[PDB]
């Protein structure tokens, strides 16, 4: 497991993967002849393994950072990435009150939504956006993994802003700050973290690419929450402001 460093909390190797997803990743990883593409498609359904891979690929010597499993593969080679995939052989999970299935389901759905949204726009590369969507709240997984019993207490007594406040008290960090710190450790440049933080405001007025990407993130989040539960006038207005064709996003 990973040590919890109070000054600079950081989990990566120890984050769990879903049993079914791990089984399938291992199956493919042990397959005699698997493509880079098939392996990446499968691996990028898992926030834990995706993070580890990005972090490895972005570690100080390398050269430019990557933000998708397929780009990591091109950069460091399929054999190295395969090693990380086979490492699952060696969880999901200890935090009693944390809904892991819900977390994994929502993370993928959001990744998929953000990819579609950005695919019809010109802000960021959709494969990189997918990854950010996948990882947008990986800080939740990390707290649940690091402090399973303490975090179960928090989860039973609070949600929303009150949960954030409770996390700060117990851990001197919260799941959103932790996410940004993780994403920063794993190689993402600050504009992406800022766009993510922006996307979490009640209302996103900000101009520029950062504002537009933030509105795209906010839309992926709210749309994903909606299916897995229409959009408010504000969100529709923000949707219109990025420019949106609809409405295969509100279902499938
Ligand atoms: Cl440490
Ligand atoms: Cl604990």
Automatic annotation (TrEMBL):
Any one GO BP annotation for this protein: cell adhesion involved in single-species biofilm formation
Superkingdom assignment: Bacteria
Keywords: Coiled coil, Phosphoprotein
Record-level GO cellular component terms: plasma membrane
GO molecular function: diguanylate cyclase activity
The UniProt record lists the keyword Coiled coil: yes
Domain HDOD span(s) in chain numbering: 15-202
UniProt keyword tRNA processing, yes or no: no
Protein name: diguanylate cyclase
